[PDB]
Symmetry: C3
Amino acid sequence: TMQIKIKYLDETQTRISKIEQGDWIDLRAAEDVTIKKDEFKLVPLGVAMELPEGYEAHVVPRSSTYKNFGVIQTNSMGVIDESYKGDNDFWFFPAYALRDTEIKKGDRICQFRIMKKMPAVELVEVEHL
Amino acid sequence: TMQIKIKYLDETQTRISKIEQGDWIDLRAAEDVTIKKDEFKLVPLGVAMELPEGYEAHVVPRSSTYKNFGVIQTNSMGVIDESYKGDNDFWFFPAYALRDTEIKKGDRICQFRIMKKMPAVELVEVEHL
Amino acid sequence: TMQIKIKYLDETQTRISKIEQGDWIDLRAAEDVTIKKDEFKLVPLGVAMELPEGYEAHVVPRSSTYKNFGVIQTNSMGVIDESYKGDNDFWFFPAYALRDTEIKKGDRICQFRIMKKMPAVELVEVEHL
Ligand SMILES: [Cl-]
Ligand SMILES: [Mg+2]
Ligand code: NA
Ligand code: NA
Ligand code: NA
């Protein structure tokens, strides 16, 4: 079956456990991050990946992220292209804190799945619809 | 056709009307909810469902939700897996209010569609990409 | 390959036709938009589109949108059904400003892709799951 190659920041990153096929996959904070109310921090997830050809990954918060950490994801959903596959192309969670909050290294703060890229399209200008 | 089994919380919930196939499907607040500026409320949607095998649902705000209700969805997009199919597995909309607001029972406050879960993937750790 | 008809607000709008290979496609502010901290504005994108039959479009912010402009998208992810294909069906980015900001005419502000609508489903009410 088609594979994703994963490289981790260092040996202290908890490896993504064996997955239940089809499920979205959780991602972990790579270090402790403190964020003050109304402030923004790009949280490292200590992974870089080579996605299957023609695929992209979508990243959103876990259901309990707001409840547990009082952050929102500022891009709503991160889109990661197949091309973002290099040796230092690490993934981040863009968190805005709605209250004072502490995120612990290892905390499962967002989740991802892969999806085929959209079919090739051609956009054609018309004067009226 | 693929069947979605749906259970309503009680007799007073307005039933999901006959759908136009393909279109996202609107969901309604199960109760009146007051939310003060800068506070958070889980809004009951009054429904639990068994989705098609190999699928998941995605839930987002309706276009008019902010204008009408002054709230954002704190998880960005809700993911509901096929396995969330229990008699007690009700759906909620996690609302953060950017202003004082009152959501009324019946209000179509978000929408959902089903989508096939991601294919078989094999994560392989590598030293370098 | 799949055709999308595009109509622009006026001749000053930046045309976005190029050979596509499945990447998301960037949309741009149709005019200057100034938003104050804790205020909301619909940002015009200066485009109306006829999507391929059976398809919908999804819109999200760009990765750098928050960093550069300090706005979030209030609906999280915009959904644009194939049915929004009329001559005045212009596209908007619903922007909530977390700090004072200035979006300039021509600025890339968000990104879209298309996706096949969800297949036909039959919703069936049950007394219990
Ligand atoms: Cl582009
Ligand atoms: Mg505030
Ligand atoms: Na850890
Ligand atoms: Na009602
Ligand atoms: Na960007």
